[PDB]
């Protein structure tokens, strides 16, 4: 530490918009360890959107998460996208011991005015 | 507003017979008090859309009843336009 | 004349001595105008579903007072903003 903070229960932040999905894993609070993006995995455009691109970022950062060492990991989910069910199926095979999955993608309470078009 | 107490109070002075609830001297009196109180309500609350609507309707109704009165009797009519002091 | 219920909520972290002094003080605020303090209660040490400022739980408290309509909030829900210990409040009718 502060590079090698060693734990056994962190958390996995996930988002999947309709143009991209990224992922990153940290400790409980948390603070950064690693991430990945389909645009960093070489992909582009539509391929950022695929479930397949979600899997590969999930793994390819998850390995950096077992760098310092970690088995259990909980989930955050923003960004309704297609990869939010294939990425996880990837993640169990990543060799981890997940405990919880709670969706937070906030529906506000009539606060802000969205864009108009279309 | 008014209370049902003062509502049942004023009739005592201006009822012709103790069973009375009509005898429009009743009506114009009670309503007169109301239009005043709502007048200063509307003073402190300069704007209301419903309020003055209610006043105007109370008024046209009042003067209608009053014209039935002066149509019927005049000694009364005088008597209470100088009791309540209204319509010059 | 009207039946005004009322709540107040204080921290659990104060010493109770503050809670006592604030009770007697508080109801002293209410009944002085001619209002008729009627019914008090301590709904109790109670866990919340929400962290107000940084806390977990606290003291729910109820009193009730019957009066004519222009005597209680006039100073109550001013002092509510003043009192550091006071957290939230609420006032209703029948």
């Amino acid at each position: 530490r502060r590079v090698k903070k060693n734990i056994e229960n962190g958390v996995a932040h996930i988002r999947s918009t309709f143009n991209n999905t990224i992922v990153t894993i940290t400790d409980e609070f948390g603070n950064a360890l690693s991430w990945s993006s389909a645009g960093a995995l070489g992909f582009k455009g539509s391929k950022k959107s695929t479930p397949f691109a979600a899997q590969m970022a999930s793994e390819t950062a998850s390995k950096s998460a077992m760098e310092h060492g970690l088995k259990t990991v909980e989930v955050t989910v923003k960004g309704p996208g297609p990869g939010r069910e294939s990425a996880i199926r990837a993640l169990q095979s990543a060799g981890l011991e997940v405990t919880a999955i709670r969706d937070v993608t906030p529906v506000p309470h009539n606060g802000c005015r969205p864009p108009k078009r279309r | 507003a008014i209370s049902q107490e003062r509502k049942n109070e004023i009739i005592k002075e201006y009822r012709v017979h103790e069973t009375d609830t009509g005898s429009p001297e009743v009506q114009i009196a009670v309503l007169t008090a109301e239009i005043n109180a709502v007048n200063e309500h509307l003073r402190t609350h300069k704007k209301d859309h419903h309020s003055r609507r209610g006043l105007l309707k109370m008024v046209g109704r009042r003067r209608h009843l009053l014209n039935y009165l002066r149509s019927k009797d005049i000694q009364r009519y005088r008597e209470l336009i100088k009791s309540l002091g209204i319509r010059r | 004349m009207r039946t005004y219920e009322v709540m107040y909520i204080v921290r659990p972290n104060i010493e109770e001595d503050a809670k006592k002094a604030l009770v007697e003080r508080f109801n002293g605020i209410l009944a002085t105008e001619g209002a008729e303090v009627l019914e008090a209660k301590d709904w109790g040490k109670r866990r919340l579903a929400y962290e107000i400022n940084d806390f977990k739980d606290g003291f729910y408290n109820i009193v009730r007072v019957k009066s004519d309509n222009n005597k209680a909030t006039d100073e109550f829900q001013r002092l509510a903003k003043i009192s550091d210990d006071i957290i939230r409040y609420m006032v209703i009718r029948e």
């Binding site: 199926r89 999955i101 969706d103 529906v107 969205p114 864009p115 108009k116 | - | -």
Partner: protein, 47 residues
Amino acid sequence: NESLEDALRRFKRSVSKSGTIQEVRKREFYEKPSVKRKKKSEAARKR
């Protein structure tokens, strides 16, 4: 011993049952306050 896919299913109705999809669907772009009620005055007989 509830497999992480079964958790993916419990989570799948967690999302499908809280209506977390269709409100973002509904709030993503502006709606005039009249057009959601042309919307519901045309859904006023479909149902």
